[PDB]
Ligand binder design. Structure first.
Ligand SMILES: [Cl-]
Ligand code: NA
Length: 162
């Protein structure tokens, strides 16, 4: 069990363009295509991201390649961010996955704005971090996923993904 398996559980897999929980055109394993309401714009982004004329449908291999790149981009966003890197560096491998999961879902800037939660995580105040992380739009809008990620921070185990 690892960051790829964890996000595959949380994001699912769709080979045709769908809308994410915010209503944004998405494909694959949670690959955001655009925030524009135009499905044509989403199709351009898809074709640009895949390197061929897709007409809104990709293969599982293409979805997994986007997923590889997206996980890498989440880690890169963490490592380049002055607020996120010290937290990441302080965490064990399982909790690092939980932080990557948040960045994959919400982006570097959004997660870097959890300033109190980030301090509690760095100080290994797990129960207090868990309570603070739930005081968020994130928890309220996607509570089942947030609960799994928070449980991962609270326990340092994969128990919520079993
Ligand atoms: Cl959810
Ligand atoms: Na939707």
């Amino acid at each position: 069990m690892n960051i790829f398996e964890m996000l595959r559980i949380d994001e699912g897999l769709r080979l045709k363009i769908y809308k994410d929980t915010e209503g944004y055109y998405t494909i694959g394993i949670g690959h955001l295509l655009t925030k524009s309401p135009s499905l044509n714009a989403a199709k351009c982004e898809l074709d640009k991201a895949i390197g061929r004329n897709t007409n809104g449908v990709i293969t599982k291999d293409e979805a997994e390649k986007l997923f590889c790149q997206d996980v890498d981009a989440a880690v890169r966003g963490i490592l380049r961010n002055a607020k996120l890197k010290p937290v990441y560096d302080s965490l064990d491998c399982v909790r690092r996955a939980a932080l990557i999961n948040m960045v994959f879902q919400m982006g570097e800037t959004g997660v870097a704005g959890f300033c109190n939660s980030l301090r509690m995580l760095q100080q290994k105040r797990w129960d207090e971090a868990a309570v603070n992380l739930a005081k968020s739009r994130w928890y309220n809008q996607t509570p089942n996923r947030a609960k799994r990620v928070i449980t991962t921070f609270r326990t340092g185990t994969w128990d919520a993904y079993k």
